Design a protein around this ligand. Structure first.
Ligand SMILES: [Zn+2]
Ligand SMILES: [Zn+2]
Ligand SMILES: [Zn+2]
Ligand SMILES: [Zn+2]
Lengths: 355, 39, 46
């Protein structure tokens, strides 16, 4: 029954992944990362301490966030001494945010937290954000109390008016204001307040936030954004960059003003036109046409081949160790199913099948 | 009894940090292990 | 270089740097919340 217990647990896990509808997700995002650096973060529940582990996972989250959302922006805020301190402006450069996080790793956390001050700062940083970007705040709360100078309820109402979205990751237990902040801001949904139960769950929670948030049906902001695809150039002599005013051997050339840039994707410092490559947009295609989940094939029926269709692995001879895709009706091994829905985003059988 | 108050100005706080660093340095030098114990 | 000798108007120079101005103002425009101050004061003969 031990082996059966694992399989049913896998089936239960697959149950949540069976209902994959092509929800409309906002690929272009604008995130504000509010981290907590207060006396409550000096505890030892997370080895070595809450401050160290959160920063380490924040750096990993920054890396993953920009890898899967290349045309998004991020900012970082820290709650220290009852005030909100800005450590990184909204920008598309993953290195600037990582550099700020590393510097924060040295200073010891102290003082009391203030959600209102952090939220008010977030409201300002997200004010100069286009209407086609999803304004989001990912708060990592660690305290069980909040000391604020004003009425937190007024700020919550203001956030809803500006179409901002808030995700709160608590540490110890539920807090009433955080639940209201996440509920009144997410159109009544109560699934945006997550409390970790161990270190492993914490890694999953950050990794989950990397994916884009599905949009509501009544929140329509459809529009066309003027983008540009520059052509990389190879120059023999170094030239001054239009963004940092330094000498760089290479760089892309904008198609609107011919001014050069060092790295992509970034908005042109001259014409304020977003510059991206075809690859940057291709990274998000799997969020618009998600691959339909594979359904376990019952052992009652007969199978097609003894080996995997994609990896040519002998199916281990009770339960059928085969997963089939309804679109192409090709059996797959258990190992392939994980790699086809997480790393890859196309069913090899469907592509191989002619039409 | 006697109550002595000390108002800490922003500049005084910076000085206190400098004194703490100097105090830590002084203690560290005194606590250096002898030569015969190092190697 | 751009506003003193070149002659660019001051108003236009700050048009593209609104977030910088706002970020600088928010730093000194926020205050800590109310809290019992005399309770934390411990006198710790002198
Ligand atoms: Zn540059
Ligand atoms: Zn340009
Ligand atoms: Zn396989
Ligand atoms: Zn298929």
């Amino acid at each position: 029954a031990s082996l059966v217990a694992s399989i049913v647990e896998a089936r239960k896990k697959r149950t949540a992944k069976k209902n994959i509808t092509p929800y409309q997700r906002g690929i272009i995002r604008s995130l504000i990362l509010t981290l907590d650096c207060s006396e409550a973060m000096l505890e030892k529940d997370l080895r070595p301490n809450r401050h160290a582990m959160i920063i380490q996972y924040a750096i990993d989250f920054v890396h993953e966030f920009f890898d899967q959302n290349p045309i998004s922006q991020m900012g970082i805020i820290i709650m220290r001494n009852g005030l909100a301190q800005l450590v990184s402006q909204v920008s598309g450069n993953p290195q600037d945010h990582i550099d700020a996080l590393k510097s924060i790793r040295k200073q010891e956390p102290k003082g009391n937290p203030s959600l209102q001050n952090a939220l008010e700062m977030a409201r300002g940083l997200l004010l100069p954000v286009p209407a086609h970007c999803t304004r989001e705040v990912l708060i990592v709360f660690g305290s069980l109390s909040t000391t604020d100078p004003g009425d937190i309820h007024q700020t919550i109402d203001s956030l809803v008016s500006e179409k901002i979205r808030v995700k709160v990751l608590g540490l110890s237990a539920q807090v009433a204001i955080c639940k209201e902040l996440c509920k009144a801001t997410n159109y009544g949904d109560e699934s945006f307040y997550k409390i970790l139960l161990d270190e492993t769950h914490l890694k999953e929670l950050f990794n989950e936030a990397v994916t884009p948030l599905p949009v509501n049906k009544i929140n329509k902001g459809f529009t066309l954004v003027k983008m540009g695809f520059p052509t990389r150039i190879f120059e023999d002599t170094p030239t001054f960059c239009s963004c940092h005013s330094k000498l760089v051997y290479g760089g892309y050339f904008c198609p609107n003003c011919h001014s050069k840039v060092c790295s992509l994707p970034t908005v042109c410092p001259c014409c304020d036109l977003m510059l991206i490559l075809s690859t940057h947009l291709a990274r998000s295609y799997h969020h618009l046409m998600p691959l339909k989940t594979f359904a376990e094939v019952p052992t009652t029926e007969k199978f097609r081949s003894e080996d995997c269709f994609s990896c040519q692995s002998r199916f281990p001879i009770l339960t059928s160790s085969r997963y089939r895709c309804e679109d192409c009706k090709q059996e797959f091994c258990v190992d392939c199913d994980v790699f086809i829905h997480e790393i890859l985003h196309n069913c090899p059988g469907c592509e191989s099948k002619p039409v | 009894a006697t109550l002595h108050i000390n108002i800490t100005t922003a500049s005084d706080e910076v000085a206190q940090r400098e004194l703490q660093e100097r105090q830590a340095e002084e203690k560290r030098k005194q606590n250096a292990v002898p030569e015969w114990h190092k190697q | 270089e751009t506003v003193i000798n070149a002659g660019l108007p001051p108003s236009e120079f700050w048009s593209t740097r609104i977030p910088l101005l706002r970020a600088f103002a928010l730093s000194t425009s926020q205050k800590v919340g109310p809290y019992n101050v005399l309770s934390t004061i411990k006198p710790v003969n002198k």
